Amino acid sequence: MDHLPIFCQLRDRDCLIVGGGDVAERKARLLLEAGARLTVNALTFIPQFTVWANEGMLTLVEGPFDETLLDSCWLAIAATDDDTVNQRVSDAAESRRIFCNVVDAPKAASFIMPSIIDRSPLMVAVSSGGTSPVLARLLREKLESLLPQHLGQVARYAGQLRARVKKQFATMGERRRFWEKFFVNDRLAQSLANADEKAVNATTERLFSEPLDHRGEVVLVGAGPGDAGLLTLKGLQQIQQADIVVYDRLVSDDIMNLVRRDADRVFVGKRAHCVPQEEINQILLREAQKGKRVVRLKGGDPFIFGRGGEELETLCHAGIPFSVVPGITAASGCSAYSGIPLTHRDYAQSVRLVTGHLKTGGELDWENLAAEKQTLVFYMGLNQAATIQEKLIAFGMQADMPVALVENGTSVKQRVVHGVLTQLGELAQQVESPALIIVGRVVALRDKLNWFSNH
Amino acid sequence: MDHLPIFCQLRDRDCLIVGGGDVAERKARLLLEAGARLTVNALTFIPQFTVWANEGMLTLVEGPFDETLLDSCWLAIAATDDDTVNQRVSDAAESRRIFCNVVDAPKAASFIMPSIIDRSPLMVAVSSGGTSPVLARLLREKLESLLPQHLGQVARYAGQLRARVKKQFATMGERRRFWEKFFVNDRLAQSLANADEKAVNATTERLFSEPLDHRGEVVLVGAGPGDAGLLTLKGLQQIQQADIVVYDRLVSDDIMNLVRRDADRVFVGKRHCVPQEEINQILLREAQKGKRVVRLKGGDPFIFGRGGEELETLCHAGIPFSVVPGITAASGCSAYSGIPLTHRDYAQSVRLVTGELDWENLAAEKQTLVFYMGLNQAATIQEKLIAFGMQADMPVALVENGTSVKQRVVHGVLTQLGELAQQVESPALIIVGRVVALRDKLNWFSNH
Ligand SMILES: Nc1ncnc2c1ncn2[C@@H]1O[C@H](CSCC[C@H](N)C(=O)O)[C@@H](O)[C@H]1O
């Protein structure tokens, strides 16, 4: 260990920053967030410093480094781009035993400012010890994704439950298991941040009312179109806490590798037999009743041609809490990765997400669809490519209207094919499921916005 | 934040610990490992202290607490079994502006000792401030298994190569590209751990003899509707390593907090609003400089904003670019309000929208409508929808600040539409369709 980390209380304590440029501004913003009684000393100050001063957030001392300025300070930071001046601040700081930091010379002075993850009162700090700030940022990025947004809320709330916990659970091992469950309760944390007192009370009582070992709930998570990088921070957080994961085939392999090493997995997709929806709905409810934290992982988004509503309406008089985490829908993913915006200046503003045929029980609206400037996007329509081609130009759609097909969008094997409407059914026998059909003038923009490799 | 973490260099610097029991022993052990010049003042001492004292690792002062023992100290730690003496230590330290910790009283004094995970020279610290000590213990455990055992070797080597990297590459973009390839090389890491210098040098020479691109780039990133948890993994990565970020007012402040702290930021808004051409210009200019530029937009860049416009000239300019999709307001707002955009017979068509609009096409059904920027045209929407064939009774819903902790949802029917719209402000979304009916058979986020 070459540095000792300490967490300093700065509320209303004198700190000094020398310098007034952009580097000095970051430092000031940070010290201010911690509540320091801050003085900034420099020859000139950028606009943001005048603003803070004009609203009573700090004190400005315009001029060259005034050493007496350190006389009653607890912390100093040399943030100028003149090494000689920074050196003098460092020397003056050290003479009076004031911990001091010199921005681009991390080990020349008293302390190093680490990269921080803020979930106050909970906080994590990472330091290179001066070797690799790049590595420190990489770690911050990883830690920011692993720590839910409102973790601080429950850290702060634990105090108001400690007593009741010791009262109901008399064994050390029991109270620990309680906190383990308490600290990963995202619904409670959110409710506290929402200032929703009834939900806070409801979720709190349930934590004491249910058996210690039960953590019953259902979470619908949108996995995105395939690229593991498109999963949401909350989705990953949810998936890492699951006891059981119920997924289908349109959930990528890269995504499943992110699922908690030994959470049970239940595949309910098309096996090389169709699992009926009511059986899927029933497994979610059943295992949540058994006390397991259930995550229903869905391809793309849960409420868009995903039948997510059905898997939830079966949960209201079961007394099983639930929640939804949206995901990037196939339309959004394929759009961005194919260089085809769904909306562009004139071409635009009506975007229609429509279903094709595997999914039926009535029949399709040709001119309502064949109608003017709206971008059309068909889900599950590869088996009616030609049947869509004929019924579109028949109702007025101009045969030279651009179209495109995107197979396995956002994945390393993404295939994009394109042309005009009179080639639809033909370009389709050049792709396989899963794929989307995009009809509209926005398709031509790809000649300028294409950035992802084709296969 | 209620505490600011800092990493102190304690070598040859005086520190003082008051107390000589087990609590004081663990404290002394860390300070010694940090290389501090330690003095321990206590009425009584346990064996280990004597061990350290005759090995010349510290100085012992036997007897009651002496206020003058703090006169040349940088840090003070009170660890006696007497609460009264412990605060005589903190009061004495404060008079001298010396950071001080009282072990059994975290809400007191001036600093707290966090839990540590050691991978020297790399180090990670975590603390609750005393609010949730079990929370921090649990996290330290998780972090110990998450961080590779030999990560310190890679970090150490990186520091040693720093001087050569700068002299071999001129631009920031190749030096940045070097480190990205560096920390991703599993052979290098495994080689350092197996102290096989041959393998280390072989791989190292190849990284240095590589032609790395020097140009910057523009990356469009979807921030989503507001909730920071809805940012994508890749979106977080991009804002975490960007050189500069261009953002508007629809990027929540929580998401803005996830941005690299030492990156520049340009507000593109209602301060009017850097008329697109102006924004479009900022992008290519900053990228021309070799910077990694991130245009952070609300929701999804290819559905709501002028994302296409912001990139359609970059190919001509020879500037690399990419797009990271985000959760659309339509998807987030609807889902957080308990309204799914589609259900079994309900919809087979979803429509996102915005003088004119084709009312007969937006009024026919078996569909779910979503209006994006339509609060001041709201009265005319129902009128046109009702006139072109839509069923009064049809449910409608407006969502304000959807997905945020301040979310609000009003509900009603086409006829009350123009009214409900004065029951809320911007930014707000309007959902028309049947699916708005199962809102409280599925409502999960808030009660308002
Ligand atoms: N990676 C992908 N690339 C192209 N289309 C995809 C896709 N993933 C899903 N799809 C489309 O989605 C259809 C199944 S319906 C499920 C859609 C999903 N809930 C979503 O929100 O995206 C497929 O037939 C296909 O048309």
Question: Any overview of this molecule?
Answer:
Chain A is of the alpha/beta class. Chain A folds into five domains: 1-112, Rossmann fold (3-Layer(aba) Sandwich), CATH 3.40.50.720; 113-148, Sirohaem synthase, central domain (Double Stranded RNA Binding Domain), CATH 3.30.160.110; 149-214, Sirohaem synthase, dimerisation domain (Helicase, Ruva Protein, domain 3, Orthogonal Bundle); 215-329, Tetrapyrrole methylase, N-terminal domain (Cobalt-precorrin-4 Transmethylase, domain 1), CATH 3.40.1010.10; 330-455, Tetrapyrrole methylase, C-terminal domain (Methyltransferase, Cobalt-precorrin-4 Transmethylase, Domain 2), CATH 3.30.950.10. Chain A is built from 18 helices and 19 strands. Chain A has helices at residues 22-33, 47-53, 83-95, 133-146, 151-157, 162-168, 172-182, 186-194, 197-209, 233-239, 253-256, 277-289, 310-313, 330-338, 366-369, 385-393, 424-428, 446-449; strands spanning 4-8, 14-18, 37-42, 59-62, 75-78, 99-102, 111-112, 115-119, 122-127, 217-224, 244-247, 264-267, 293-299, 322-325, 350-355, 375-379, 402-407, 415-420, 435-439. In chain A, the strands form four sheets. A five-stranded parallel beta sheet of chain A has the order 4-3-2-5-6, with helices on both faces. In chain A, a hairpin with a 7-residue loop joins β17 (402-407) and β18 (415-420). In chain A, α8 (186-194) packs antiparallel against α9 (197-209). Chain A is globular. Chains A and B meet through β1, α1, β7, β8 and β9 of A and β1, α1, β7, β9 and α4 of B. β9 of chain A pairs antiparallel with β9 of chain B. S-adenosyl-L-homocysteine (SAH) is lined by residues 225-226, 250, 298-301, 304-306, 329-330, 334, 379-380, 406, 408-410, 433-436 of chain A. Chain A: InterPro entries: 4pyrrol_Mease, 4pyrrol_Methylase_sf, 4pyrrole_Mease_sub1, 4pyrrole_Mease_sub2, CobA/CysG_C, NAD(P)-bd_dom_sf, Siro_Cobalamin_biosynth, Sirohaem_synt_dimer_dom_sf. Chain A: S-adenosyl-L-methionine binds at residues 225, 299-301, 304, 329-330, 380, 409, 435. Chain A: Residues 216-446 are annotated as: Uroporphyrinogen-III C-methyltransferase. Chain A: In the N-terminal section; belongs to the precorrin-2 dehydrogenase / sirohydrochlorin ferrochelatase family. In the C-terminal section; belongs to the precorrin methyltransferase family. Chain A: Its EC number is 2.1.1.107, 1.3.1.76, 4.99.1.4.
